Structures are given as structure tokens and as C-alpha cells.
Design a protein around this ligand. Sequence first.
Ligand SMILES: C[C@@]1(c2cc(NC(=O)c3ccc(C#N)cn3)ccc2F)CCOC(N)=N1
Ligand code: NA
Ligand code: NA
Length: 376
Amino acid sequence: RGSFVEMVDNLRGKSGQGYYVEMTVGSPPQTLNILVDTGSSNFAVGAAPHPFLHRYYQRQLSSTYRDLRKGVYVPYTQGKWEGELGTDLVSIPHGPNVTVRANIAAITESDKFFINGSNWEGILGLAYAEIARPDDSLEPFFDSLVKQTHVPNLFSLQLCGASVGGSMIIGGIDHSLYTGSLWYTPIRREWYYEVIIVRVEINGQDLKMDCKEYNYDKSIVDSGTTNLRLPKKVFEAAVASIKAASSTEKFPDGFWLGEQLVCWQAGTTPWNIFPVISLYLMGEVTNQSFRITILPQQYLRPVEDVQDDCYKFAISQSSTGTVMGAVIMEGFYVVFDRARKRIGFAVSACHVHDEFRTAAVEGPFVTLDMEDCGYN
Ligand SMILES: C[C@@]1(c2cc(NC(=O)c3ccc(C#N)cn3)ccc2F)CCOC(N)=N1
Ligand code: NA
Ligand code: NA
């Protein structure tokens, strides 16, 4: 409880490529780097010599592998994977000192899935059974962990943005990782980590949309997506406020659609011209909310593959609802308190800020009719 020094700093990554944790699978153990993803529910690992992979799971080496004799085919918007299901012993070296028999999907064919040049070779789907493929009787990793050990039913994430690293605390919260207080929002349904956004401000000016728009058709917290994604109508209104608040300079409008990069001379990006963005989330108590505030440092992402200082606009339009991706999460320490069905936010002790502004988590606020904000 409250102090897990062996787990601090157990995540790594590179800009644009996500945050991964070291895992071992099988007997004797095979070490793999595995992307941490709160937006999906399968533990799936490269199991064949795909040319982009540093390492892959070799079932034939594991004396503890058991075949489930069932294939899985998983298409996404961008690309797909398919593989073969089994179970094996899994452990997290910089994690609790336990071993668990978990489901693993051994990926034997994929397309647009692995990143050329990245250092991970599998994905740890940390969300619930309801979105597991092929169906909800395939128990997710973290459910197996809790069922089989005395690890408490919660984990927390601190993602430190730009090389990147962070911490995933399995079984607890580490208080040195955040400042001020944790504020909690209810998990509305256990499938994704679905939450309810009740109001949206751009430099403290309310968007004034019906709040049901903010959650059309859901809002989720997703470490496996880079951007803040917003439902289309909300995106349209948010950009229009961001441009106004910022029209102290004039950028190519393709910039706002994420279609072109913008660059300044190294040394001073003018952060001060860009507004803060606040999301009010449903609180624990009737008619009570709290608000989280992110900076341009979070939503303007450095792009490194080209001489000066180039950024991509990292808020984008969505058709799958609001996605609070690594753009939101890098401001906060986020607690996935599955035992009490709630998600905690606090200011991260590592978030990227300047001398004038920081990220913020503040409450309570009085917000009426917060249940009307959910979409059915
Ligand atoms: C399973 C699925 C997925 C996710 C990923 N993520 C990343 O590459 C990735 C890249 C950068 C960041 C950051 N900062 C986080 N994730 C790759 C394939 C992939 F299939 C589907 C889409 O959405 C979710 N969350 N997970
Ligand atoms: Na348990
Ligand atoms: Na603290």
C-alpha cells in the first residue's frame, strides 16, 4: 500500500510509439517488451519472425504452454492481426513478485500492426472481458492476475512524455508519483474504461454544447492511442475556439487537421499563445464534478524525424467517441481503481510544463444533470 519502489520507472518508450513494460512468458522465461494498452483486453504477442520484431514468443521452448486449439482473427480500422490461443505462465519482472497462468494469443500473421523501428513486440490489453476477442469468456490478463494471487484489483499509470518512460504500479498507488489530491470519476460501464465528460472549456470559455455531444457514443481513457480524439461536432467547436484563442499567429489550416506539421526555430516554441483545455468529469457525488486541465505541451507533440523544432497537432476528430489518449494521460497520474469502479486523476509529478502554467486537477464543482451526458 502507497509505496512500490521496485515498480517505479518500469515503463519505457519512444515518442509516437507508446509505452511498454518488460514481461516474461513461459518456462524457462522468455523476456518480451509489451505495449501497455487500457483500450483493449487481449494479451497478444508476436509468435513468428516478422522482420520488424526484435524478439517473439517461441511456444516450442516453453514446457508450460497449453494450446487452446482455437484461432482468433482481429481486424482494426488500421490493420489486423490473427493468431492461435493458448495459456502459459506470465510474470512482470519489475512488478509484483508472482507468476500467473494467463491466456496468450500467439500472433502468426498481421498487417499495419507492429511499428517498424519500435522496441515492442506484443500488447497487454488492460480493459475488461466484454471487449476481449473472440468473446468475453477469454479472461483478460489482469482478471487472471487478481483471481490467482493476492494482488489488489487496481493499477495505476504515470506516463512521462518527451525517449519517454513512466511507471505502471500493479496492485497499488505510489504517492511520490503525483502532487495534490486524487479526484475520482465513476467507470460508467466495465468494457473500455468508459467515463462521462460533463463540460469542456478552452482557456476557461465553455463550449456550451449539449454535454451528450461530449460522450457520443462513449468517452474512454486509452494508453494505447496517442491523441485526444473528440467526436466530430465537438472537434469542430474546439478547433474553432483554439484558433480564435490563438489567432495571434496564423498557421496553415491543414495543421489543425493534423495534415501538416508546424515548425519554429529551436529554443522558443511560443506555448503562451496556445490556450489550456479543461475537461470536467462526472464526480463521485450527485451534482458534483471536478476538472482536469492540460497544456499545449501536451497536445502539441514534438516530431523528430525532421532541421528545426516541428510539432503535430495532437487533437483529432473521432467517430468512436472521445478518446483520452497519451495526450491527456501524460499530464496526470491515473488510477484504474477497478475494485470500486472509478478512475482517479492527480497532477503527475513528472508532467511537462513551463514557468507560467502547469496541468491541474481541481474540484469540487457543481454540475447539474450529469446523467443526461451519457449516451445509450
Ligand atoms: C489494439 C489497439 C492498438 C494500439 C496500438 N498502439 C500504438 O501503436 C501506440 C502508439 C503510440 C502511443 C502513444 N503515446 C500509444 N499507442 C497499436 C496497434 C493496435 F492494434 C487498437 C487501437 O487502439 C488501441 N487502444 N489499441
Ligand atoms: Na486475489
Ligand atoms: Na503525492
